[PDB]
């Protein structure tokens, strides 16, 4: 807006990344309707949905603090920008991030608020129960004057989710943070992770995210989010088509799973000038990538049935994003070299796979050497 902040410094390696939003424990934001529910009380059956998940939950994302923790464990450096209350739960969240060696100088305390607590009022409009927000939680109440500009000056990637778009206060604060980061040369990473309200209608969501979509240099979306934003019914019809008499080629006879790679012309409504990399994730199975110059897909895999009693997919979406951010900062040729980009994205695939082998997102985030080991075990040496 006006000037700089802090003292210019040689800025130790690896380059810092900043994660913006709400620090929460667990809290899966992406919620849709699944048609295969287990017993409502016997939660010992619910693990069967971890190894036959709904498609929107194949590699779930989470709060931005998950990405920061996962990024640090993968060998990077990260700082979290956000607000917590001055109560005991607020200290626990900060102590969790300090233990994981995430910088918390960008975390502001609000001594008059209770962490993760929203005051709402219950109404009975048209014979139905609804709630409306009376006072937002401290997590969604960071002000622009409370931004740590030293972090925004140092950080090379600014990362945020669409959960901040559900808060009037955070949305205004978000666009001041983006302005500062761009002024200092930072790249903007938009990890969509649509919360429950934003799944209601395509047109309302497209209007709501359009401004933040246009400010982003890197975007990660799931296959379900991308199809919802373009046309959900066209792609479902496309998946359900079966030739009447004979297959068009030998591969169509095998009745394999659909890994459709969207053409850059289908993606065109969502492309803009400043966008450097679009990644569409089909869990860890496929990573479709799109650049101004080229596009392609990285083939991955998953194995949660290798450990049926400890598998938990929560947080695996954050590990994939953290793995992308770890390689983008240290391998800047990823943006311009296709072969280099594919090799580096296989590192992100491996991180997602390991993350699904432990109960709890933070508890199961993998280290760099474990991720590198799994990548070399899974892929043939020519693909490393």
């Amino acid at each position: 807006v006006d000037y700089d902040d802090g003292i210019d410094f040689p800025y130790d390696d690896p380059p810092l990344v900043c994660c913006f939003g709400a620090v929460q424990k667990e809290f899966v934001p992406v919620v849709r309707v699944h048609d295969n529910p287990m017993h409502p009380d016997i939660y010992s059956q619910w693990k069967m949905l971890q190894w036959d998940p709904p498609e929107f939950g194949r590699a779930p994302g989470g709060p931005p603090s998950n990405v920061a923790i996962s990024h640090v464990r993968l060998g990077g450096r990260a700082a979290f920008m956000g607000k917590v209350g001055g109560d005991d739960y607020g200290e626990e969240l900060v102590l969790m991030m300090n233990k994981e060696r995430v910088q918390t100088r960008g975390v502001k305390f609000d001594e008059g608020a209770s962490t993760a607590c929203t005051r709402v009022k219950i109404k009975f409009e048209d014979g139905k129960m609804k709630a409306e927000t009376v006072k937002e939680p401290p997590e969604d109440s960071l002000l622009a004057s409370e931004l740590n500009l030293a972090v925004l000056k140092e950080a090379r990637i600014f990362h945020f989710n669409s959960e901040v778009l559900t808060s009037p206060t955070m949305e205004s604060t978000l666009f001041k943070a983006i302005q500062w980061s761009k002024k200092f040369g930072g790249l903007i990473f938009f990890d969509l992770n649509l919360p429950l309200p934003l799944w209601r209608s395509r047109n309302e969501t497209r209007k709501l995210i359009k401004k933040s979509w246009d400010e982003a240099n890197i975007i990660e979306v799931s296959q379900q989010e991308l199809e919802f934003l373009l046309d959900e019914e066209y792609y479902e019809r496309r998946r359900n088509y079966t030739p009447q008499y004979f297959a068009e080629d030998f591969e169509q006879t095998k009745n394999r799973r659909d890994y459709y790679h969207y053409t850059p012309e289908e993606i065109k409504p969502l492309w803009h000038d400043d966008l450097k990399l679009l990644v569409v994730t089909d869990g860890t199975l496929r990573l479709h990538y799109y650049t101004p110059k080229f596009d392609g897909v990285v083939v991955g895999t998953e194995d949660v049935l290798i450990t049926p009693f400890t598998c938990d997919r929560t947080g695996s979406g954050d590990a994939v994003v953290a793995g992308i951010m770890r390689k983008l900062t240290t391998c800047p040729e990823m943006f311009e070299d296709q072969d280099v980009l594919e090799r580096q994205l296989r590192f992100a695939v491996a991180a997602g796979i390991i993350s699904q082998w432990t109960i709890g997102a933070v508890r199961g985030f993998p280290t760099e050497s474990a991720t590198q080991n799994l990548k070399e075990q899974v892929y043939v040496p020519s693909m490393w």
Binding site: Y43, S44, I354, W357, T358, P366, Q377, S382
Partner: protein
């Protein structure tokens, strides 16, 4: 050069580079039967990575200090096999260098490696100068230095015990070198295995079946036994 290194046993290529030749051209998969053709795509193996071991780690550490020279950046299976046969010779060389270094610097300078809190100059001349200006001989100063050593540092220093004689290279290896002995972190995280030693098993956790009803109470509940 060569043939003098070979005669003396100094590090040298097993095959003289001057008297080394290519292997011409071999069958190019069009002059070959099907069973001898290379697959078009590389095949996953589970044996595609070299097995980590102690010999690989020690040879690399010795290559960086110059004690040996290898053909390339990473030791071959031939070089690790040869190291296994002669590894005691190289360790003896390192142990001898530590003995000569102690005899040169004196006990104060040598053992101050394991007394971090000691900030006085530990050179032989400083030890002598302290003795003249204060009357405390070298043995008195050494006893004073060891009074500032923690129990953690003392246990590390036990590698210099004259009966233990730990490999000096082993004593100064960093964590990133050591963990390549087994090949780094396990892909399956160890936190899955870890349990508190004083934990009480929660029999209503997700990995437990539903509680077993009392057989009599179950029969009465389903109306097959009357009170």
């Amino acid at each position: 050069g060569f043939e003098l290194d070979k005669k003396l046993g100094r590090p040298h290529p097993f095959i003289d580079p001057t008297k080394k030749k290519q292997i011409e051209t071999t069958l190019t998969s069009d002059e070959s039967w099907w069973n001898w053709r290379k697959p078009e795509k590389e095949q996953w193996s589970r044996w595609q990575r070299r097995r980590p071991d102690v010999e690989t780690v020690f040879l690399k550490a010795m290559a960086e200090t110059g004690q040996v020279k290898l053909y390339g950046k990473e030791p071959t299976l031939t070089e690790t096999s040869l190291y296994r046969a002669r590894r005691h010779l190289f360790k003896e060389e390192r142990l001898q260098a530590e003995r000569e270094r102690l005899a040169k610097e004196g006990p104060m300078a040598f053992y101050s490696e394991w007394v971090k809190a000691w900030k006085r100059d530990t050179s032989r001349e400083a030890v002598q100068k302290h003795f003249e200006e204060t009357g405390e001989d070298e043995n008195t100063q050494l006893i004073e230095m060891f009074s500032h050593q923690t129990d953690r540092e003392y246990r590390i220093m036990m590698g210099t015990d004259v009966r233990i004689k730990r490999d000096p290279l082993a004593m100064r290896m960093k964590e990133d070198q050591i963990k390549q002995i087994w090949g780094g972190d396990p892909v399956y995280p160890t936190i899955n295995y870890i349990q508190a030693p004083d934990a009480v098993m929660d029999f209503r956790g997700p990995d437990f079946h539903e509680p077993t009803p009392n057989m009599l109470s179950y029969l009465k509940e389903n109306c097959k036994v009357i009170s």
